[model samples]
Target: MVNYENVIVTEITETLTFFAQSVESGSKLESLMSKLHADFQSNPPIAGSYTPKRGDLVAAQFTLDNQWYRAKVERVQGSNATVLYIDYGNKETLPTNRLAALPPAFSSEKPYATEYALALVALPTDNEDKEEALRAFSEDVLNHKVQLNVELKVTGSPNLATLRDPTTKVDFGKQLVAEGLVLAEQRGERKLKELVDQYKAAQEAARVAHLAIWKYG
Candidate 1:
């Protein structure tokens, strides 16, 4: 048998490194071609070299601690995809330029972004409560693409926001609280006084009015 360690593997490594270099400086099509060549050179042979559509399962390479690992595709855009790393439980947005179609045999569990309003709203913890919240959200608010006024740097957990329904032009956060569909969250140090004041006022109003969650809270 040929000595893979000394010759074949070394040649393949060099070939891939060369192709990777070319890709760094190449056009889009040229870059894809380089990845295709590198995939063919890899062992176990990775191969999804075509453009990916949304929801397509893909293997995407990402750098961690100076080494590369492949992640699972969650959502695909025109040239980028949001991926979840099966090993690390971290998510990242990566260009489709470095992603490949995973072989059919390579299987793994699939893993799966959001904006906000109301400064802060707590998701339901209990299974039934959670389903109730989801049903209310879908029925009353999720019907349209709502616009938002961000009161924080990012609309993430614990960050506050105000949402406006595009069609009705209503303040969604205030409306949700008024309806008791969501509980107003209080952020002592992170939120602005005006925002905190508004959220608390809405929450208190819900409690007094015995709106959605308040009726049971």
Candidate 2:
């Protein structure tokens, strides 16, 4: 059994996005956090402020979109708080303003970054196209602490994982799709529904914007 925990990324491959991503619905992570955490942090922030601790429900901005999303506190370190973005599966170290009480609907999931080649996305390794994706991959997560939330366990290949930057708070898997350096894959692994939609949207945007691979297509 893979015990999902955080570790720094030391390896990169020509085609793998370092985690398994999926476009399907009802993944391990989705059901686990979707219901429990919603009730876990039911109490609203009292008198205009919320005292944070490890595993508390909170909110953080989507790095790319700036919209608030549910984030679970990982560390309430003095003077600063680091949190895990639940639906997207990344961690962020932020100032006070970076954390907020999520609107009720956002607290709909949990996380567990696992060991898989990024869910739902793949880089083209059959040709020289890998070189471009390689540069972007290394630049983003070559040797950084990555939060791998395992979303699916597939036989004959690595399980699906959400690779997220603990500091910069970027979901590297989604980033690849957004950059248009990779191809969107349809696999059977269950997925983070919200994240799947988000990733697909990024891919579409990249396709329309003509960033890289899709530019020539």
Candidate 3:
């Protein structure tokens, strides 16, 4: 029961994969973001200071939103730097001027958000179903403080998590399967027996309802 309580979904890269930040961390100490925004605004990096190099943690201005965020420099060229926002899992190439030296007093804690794959679930095999699932999944989960449970973790792979709706405690993976937007992976071995069965039940429910990918079979 590795539970991450009150995590806000931040980035959705796949139908079953996303990034999230724990509100618990954001509360009380402003460790997640609140403090950094104000600090960066007041003490932005000097324009003529040292160039951003690979592996430097700096504040980068989001080009579209124009928000300040803590970013790790991945690479640097003449005038642009490739940065990975440490808090949120988005990366961008922006001019070095937008980069700032995070004051040492501020911490370089691990990335504020963690990437998770929906456990015991799989994206639909059909391309149309896949696209539709991604479209619906994004609408369903963003901007909300939801619960996440880490069920599996592997090196070089994202940790698998089970997500729940904030208010109703509804299982999200089950919902997607029941709605026929995606498919549950068939359980092999005896592992996650309960989880696999519940989601597979949802898939069966979708089949009976004749929803989306299940409409034919």
Candidate with the greatest lDDT versus the true structure: 3
Rank list by lDDT: 3, 2, 1
Candidate models: Cα lDDT each: 0.50, 0.63, 0.80
What is the C-alpha RMSD, rounded to one decimal, of candidate 1?
Answer: 18.4
**What TM-score number comes out for model 3?**
0.82
* Shift of residue 21 alpha carbon in model 1, Å: 33
Who wins the TM-score comparison? 3
**What CA root-mean-square deviation does each model show from the true structure?**
18.4, 14.5, 2.8
Ranking by TM-score: 3, 2, 1
Better of 2 and 3 by TM-score: 3
Residue-by-residue lDDT tens digits, candidate 3, 93-193: 88998877777655546677888887877888898888889888778888778888887676898887888886788878788899998888875647578
**Regions more than 4 Å wrong, model 3:** 1-4, 28-35, 48-50, 75-78, 187-189
- Mark the 10 consecutive residues where model 3 has the least summed lDDT: 25-34
Using TM-score as the yardstick, the better of models 1 and 3 is 3
Q: Tens-digit lDDT track for model 1 on 58-155?
A: 66666453223445677877777887654334567877766666665443422212222345666544566556765655554442444545466643
